[PDB]
C-alpha cells in the first residue's frame, strides 16, 4: 500500500516465529523499541498489528517513536510509548519502474498532525488559502497527495523501501500470540525433570497401560498427585513413577 | 492575488533578539508551508527555517537552537524570533510560501537585519546642483541600510538613477540619486529628494535647484 | 549537505541567442530541482519546478532539462528584462540548499557616457567636508575608467565609485565617482576635473569646474 | 460594574444662578457617592462625600442631595472659578467606577477678540517648513470662525486650530490657528491674511502681511 | 613586553549591566592572578575583585553578589560582568596581573564606567583664535567623560595643554585645549583640533585660525 493509505493486518489467534525475521538477511532496518529482539519468542501478546507501506529511503528514520517528518505527521504516526519492531527493506527491484511508478503516494498537506495510529485516506481538495474554494482545484487549492516517482536508476535514499511495523499490543483479553514452544526428544525410563504443557516435576517416565479419553491430558490418584500424563507430540500415555528415595 | 509584506528589521546588538513579522493577504499562513530564507549582501540564497502545514518546524544546522519560527493563525501572520544573533546573520530575510518544503512559489519583499555594535545615525542630505541637465542629491554618513530616495513623491520615475551605497573608511554609507531632466523645466518644475531612513525616522524632503 | 555549483559565474550574451545555464549537484537529486530568477532589488520569483515544469506566468522561452547530477536552464531568445541572477535549488535532501547563482547580463551596441560634474554645495563645506561628484549616465560597456585631476594633479585612493546594475529597459549602466576631501584641502586648490576614458569615447572626456565660480 | 451617567454633558450658565448636576447609578448605591471638581490641568479635588457632607475647605455654595439611583450636586451661585469638570464616584460596589463628567462653563458678556498675526521666522524657513500663526485673544463666546486667505484664495484642510480652556479670572477664551505650508509653496505667494468672524465683531476682521516686509 | 588593553566603558543606567574586557599580549590570563581595581575620580585606589591562577574568584565585601570576574583562555581575555550598578560605581577600572593576590606587577590603562541617569550628549567644539601666539579650542557641553583632543593628528605634542574638564551648573562638562605656537607659522601651518568623543561617536576635526 501507499503510506497515506497504509495497510493494517491484525495478526491474532496464531503462533509467531519472530526469529525467522530477525535472522533474515534481507531486512535493512530491524529496530525493536519497547522489547528486546531475541525475547520475542518468549513473550506472549494479546494481538499484533502489522502496518505495511512503502516510503523513500531517507524517510525510514521517521518511523520511530518521537520522530517528526512528513510521514510521522501526515501519513503514519507512532506513539511515544511505542512497543514493537519497525522492519524496513529496500524494494528498488519491485516498486520501481523505468517509465515511472506513480502508484505510491504520500500526504503532503494536512491541517493538523495525525494522532498515533490514525489513518486518513480522504482525497478532498485542500483549502490552502481559505478563499471560497468550492471543491474545484486550482490556485490556492492543492491536491493533498504527492506521488513518489520511482526509477531503478535512483540512488540510495530515493529508492523505494517497504516498511512493516509490528505493534504488539496486550489488552487484558486472553493472549493468543506466542512464540514457538521448543520441544526436545522424549527420554524414558530415567529420572528426569519433565515439563509437559506447564506441568513440571521430577520422575521416571515409563509406558502406561491407562487408556485416556481423548480430551484428558494428565492423571491423578486419590492423593491428587500426577501419576499419569499424555505426551503432546505423540498421543501416548506415560506413567510418572517418583524417583527412588530411601533410608540408608 | 497574494501579497507578502514583512516588518521588524533594523539594528540589533551581537547577541540580541529580533522578531520578524510576515503578513499574508491572498492565502492563510496556518495551512501552508511557510519558510524564512537568508540572502547575505553579495552572497546567494540560504535557507534558514520552515514551518509545516501542521506546525512542524525545521532549521538549518548553522542556526539551530537560536531561531524559532511560529505562526498566528487568526489573521494570517508568520513570525521569526531570533536569539543570540551573530555578526554573520546580517542579511535580507524573505518569508515564502512553499508547495511543501520544496520550491518557494511566492516570496516576500524581504526585511534587512543588520547585526553590528554601531549606533543608528541619521543621514545628511546634500544637493547636487545642475549647470538636458542632470541633477541629484548626495545621501551621506548614515547607518544602517536602507535609505529610500524618491523624487516628487514618486511622480518622477523616468531617468531616476539611485546608486548603490558605498561603505566609507569611517564605516558609514554614502549614495547619490541623480535624474536627467530637460533644461526647459528647470525654472518651472521643482525637484524634491524624498530621502527616508526608517531606521532613524528621518524624512528629509530637500529641494534641489540650479 | 548538497553543494550546488553554477556554470558559468557570469553570462554576457546578445539579445536573441541561446542562454544555457548549467547547475551541478554534489549528490544526485532525481527531479528535485527548481530554478528562480532574481532581478536586482526584487525578491526571487520561481521560474520552473521539478526541473522541467514552468510555473504559471513564466514566459515560454524559459525551459529546463537534466536529471541526476547535471541540470540545465535554457532561455531560447534573451530579452532586455532577463538581466538577473538565476539560482538553482535542490530539495530532495533535508537541508534545502541553493546554488551560488549565475549573473546573466545582456550585450548592447556601444554607447558613449553622458558626463556631468557636481561641485560641493557650501552647506557641506560648513560641515567640514567636501565631495565632488562625477556622473556617467547611460553607457555600455560597464568597463569605464574615471580619473580625478586636482589642478592637473592625479589623486589616488580618495575617491569611491558606485555603479548601478544594468537597466531592464535600455540595457545601459550608470556610474558615480565621489571625491572626498577635507574643507581646508578643498579650499587650497582651484580647478577640479574628471577624466572619463571609455570604449565609446575616441578621446577622454574632461569635465572641470573652478572653485570660485 | 456600576455605570454612572451624568446630566447634562455640558452646562453653560450665567454667574449667580442655580447649577443643578444630576448623576444616575446603574444599580442603587445607598449613600456611597462622592463629588469631585477638576479644573483644567489640575488634579481632581474632593468636593463632597457620602452624597451630602462637604469636605473641609469647600465653599458653602456646593451642596449635594439624593439617594439610591438619583443624586444631585447643586451650586447655588456660580462664580468665575467654578468652570471645571465635575465627577460623581460610587464606592458601594467593589469596582470603584467614576462618572463620565459634566463640563460646567460660565457665561459672559460678549467680548470681541484681539487679533494678531505672526509671520514665520526665517530660521524655520531654512528648516523647510513655514507656519503662519493667527492669534485670537480674550473673547467670548468660544464659537469663532477663522478663515485663511493666501493672495485672496481660500485654503482648506492645511490649518490646525488650538483653543484654550475658559479662564478662571476673566472668563474669556483664546484661539491659535496655525497654517502649515512647505518652503517653496510659501515663497510662491505674497500676501497672507487671516479672516476672523465672531459674534462680537459686526464685520470680519482681516489681519494680513506681505512676505517681503 | 606585555600590553593590557581594556574596553567596554560608557554610560549605564543605575541598576544596569556592563561587561568590561581586558586583552593581554605578553602573558596568558589563564595561568596568572588577574584583578580588577577601582579608582573613583579624585579618590584613591580600591580593590574590586581577583581571579586566582586555578580559577578561584574573590570580591570586595561592598561589591559581592553583583560583579563576576571570568576568563576566556583561548586568546587571553579577562572579563568583568557588572550587575545592579549603583551610583558609587562610577570610576576608572583597571585590570592588573598580580604576583599572587598581592602586588600588581603590570596594570591596564583603565576604562571609565559612569553610572548616571543622564543621556549621551555630543560635544560642541569652538575655536579660541589667537591675536609667540597661543590658540586653542573649547570643548563644551558634553556627557560623559572622556573627550580626547589631539592636534594635527598627534603631530603637535610640544606645548599642548589640554585642561581637565569642569562640571557646569547645567550638569555637562567643559574643557579647553590650548597650544603655544610661533607667530611666524601662523600664516603657513594650519592647526586642527581632533576632538573625539567615543561615547557619542563624535569625530570633529576643526580648523583653528587667527
Ligand atoms: C505431531 O506429529 C506427529 C508426527 O510428526 C504425529 O504423529 C502426531 O499425531 C502429531 N500430533 C498431533 C497432536 O496431531
Author numbering:
A (entry chain A): 348 to 595
B (entry chain D), E (entry chain H): 1 to 131, 139 to 217
C (entry chain E), D (entry chain G): 1 to 213
Paper lines:
To understand the effects of these antibodies at a structural level, we next determined cryo-EM structures of the complexes formed by VH ab8 (variable domain of the bivalent fusion construct VH FC Ab8) and Fab ab1 (the antigen binding fragment of IgG ab1) with the N501Y mutant spike protein ectodomain. Similar cryo-EM analyses of the complex between the mutated spike protein and Fab ab1 show that in contrast to the VH ab8 complex, Fab ab1 binding involves either 2 or 3 RBDs, all being in the up position. (A and B) Atomic models for the 2 predominant conformations of the spike protein (gray) observed with Fab ab1 (blue) bound to either 2 (A) or 3 (B) receptor binding domains (RBDs) in the up position. In cryo-EM experiments, Fab ab1 also binds the RBD in only the up position, but in contrast, the much smaller VH ab8 fragment binds the RBD in both up and down positions. Residue 501 is at the periphery of the Fab ab1 footprint, with Ser 30 of Fab ab1 in a position to interact with this residue. The N501Y mutation would thus be expected to have a small effect on the antibody binding epitope. Together, the cryo-EM structures are fully consistent with the studies presented in Fig 2 that show a small but significant effect of the N501Y mutation on Fab ab1 binding and neutralization, but with no measurable effects on VH ab8 binding or neutralization. Second, competition experiments establish that IgG ab1 more efficiently prevents ACE2 binding of the unmutated ectodomain compared to the N501Y mutant, while VH Fc ab8 prevents ACE2 binding of unmutated and N501Y mutant spike proteins to similar extents.
